[PDB]
Amino acid sequence: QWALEDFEIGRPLGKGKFGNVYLAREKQSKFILALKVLFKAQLEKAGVEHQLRREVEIQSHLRHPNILRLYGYFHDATRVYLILEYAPLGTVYRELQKLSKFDEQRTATYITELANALSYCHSKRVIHRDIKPENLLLGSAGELKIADFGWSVHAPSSRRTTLAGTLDYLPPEMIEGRMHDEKVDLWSLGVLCYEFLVGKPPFEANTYQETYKRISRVEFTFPDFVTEGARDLISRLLKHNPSQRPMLREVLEHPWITANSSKPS
Numbered sequence: 001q002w003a004l005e006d007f008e009i010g011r012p013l014g015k016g017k018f019g020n021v022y023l024a025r026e027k028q029s030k031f032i033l034a035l036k037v038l039f040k041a042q043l044e045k046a047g048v049e050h051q052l053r054r055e056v057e058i059q060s061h062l063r064h065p066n067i068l069r070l071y072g073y074f075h076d077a078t079r080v081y082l083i084l085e086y087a088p089l090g091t092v093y094r095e096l097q098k099l100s101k102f103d104e105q106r107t108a109t110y111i112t113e114l115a116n117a118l119s120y121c122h123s124k125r126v127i128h129r130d131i132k133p134e135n136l137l138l139g140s141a142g143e144l145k146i147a148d149f150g151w152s153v154h155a156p157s158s159r160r161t162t163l164a165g166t167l168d169y170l171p172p173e174m175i176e177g178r179m180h181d182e183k184v185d186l187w188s189l190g191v192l193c194y195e196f197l198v199g200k201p202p203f204e205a206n207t208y209q210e211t212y213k214r215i216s217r218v219e220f221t222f223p224d225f226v227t228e229g230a231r232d233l234i235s236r237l238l239k240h241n242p243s244q245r246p247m248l249r250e251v252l253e254h255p256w257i258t259a260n261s262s263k264p265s
């Protein structure tokens with residue numbers, strides 16, 4: 001259907017391991033959107049054609065205000081182009097760089113939006129498994145949107161693909177290649193809540209090995225400024241045993257969440 005010729009490409013929005021994302025406008029409609037560009041030889045080499053397929057299938061069919069829309073795709077013998085909803089306010093990653101730490105209202109609002117999106121995903125047994133600030137985008141009203149569903153699967157699942165980057169957002173079962181399910185995204189929510197309030201993730205370390213050790217032993221401590229309500233939610237989410245992690249409904253109705261969030265469940 002679409003081809004490269006139908007679009008005027010604009011400024012670079014960002015770069016991932018595989019994605020090179022650009023602002024773009026469709027010529028006929030003048031519709032502004034984001035083009036995620038992937039190099040076929042890079043996908044083949046790393047063997048992640050299944051991730052690309054997964055991303056297209058899942059994001060084209062999911063419909064939720066806190067999940068980024070994928071509209072379609074096309075290709076040209078060197079690259080694949082995913083046609084995405086454009087997120088004008090950038091990433092939570094950037095915003096964290098800007099502000100260093102988030103206040104409790106901003107944190108609880110993001111956690112609420114995340115939890116609403118994940119609740120919708122999990123109802124279909126879709127687990128994301130790659131929740132981290134670079135994959136959380138902001139819409140025109142500043143609302144969080146989950147993107148980058150390439151690592152997503154239907155639960156329960158094993159891990160077949162190599163872990164390339166940081167382990168910071170991943171639970172013990174996921175790193176160790178054990179079977180896992182929905183509860184992986186709950187652990188990640190805990191990591192995010194801590195990072196939002198503190199400015200860095202709780203198991204952060206100087207090496208991959210040190211990071212892995214901290215995660216498998218669940219070794220984290222709180223700075224003095226983290227309030228008791230936050231400590232409670234975060235402690236509940238960051239449990240080694242997945243079955244002990246709370247339900248998303250329990251996150252949404254947590255007293256620290258309901259007192260600080262500007263958005264409802």
Ligand SMILES: Nc1ncnc2c1ncn2[C@@H]1O[C@H](COP(=O)(O)OP(=O)(O)O)[C@@H](O)[C@H]1O
Pocket residue numbers: 013014015016017018019020021034036068084085086087088090091134135137147148150
């Ligand atoms: N729809 C979008 N709107 C605005 N920026 C985006 C969009 N998609 C991606 N980006 C930016 O590009 C980066 C990489 O995109 P992503 O889809 O995560 O690629 P990868 O799959 O390689 O990680 C994101 O971290 C973000 O900075």
Ligand SMILES: [Cl-]
Pocket residue numbers: 029031
């Ligand atoms: Cl249209």
Ligand SMILES: [Cl-]
Pocket residue numbers: 156157158159
């Ligand atoms: Cl599997």
Ligand SMILES: [Cl-]
Pocket residue numbers: 158159160161
């Ligand atoms: Cl996998």
Ligand SMILES: [Cl-]
Pocket residue numbers: 119247248249250
């Ligand atoms: Cl729930």
Ligand SMILES: [Mg+2]
Pocket residue numbers: 016134135148
């Ligand atoms: Mg990404």
Ligand SMILES: [Mg+2]
Pocket residue numbers: 016018148149150151
């Ligand atoms: Mg990806």
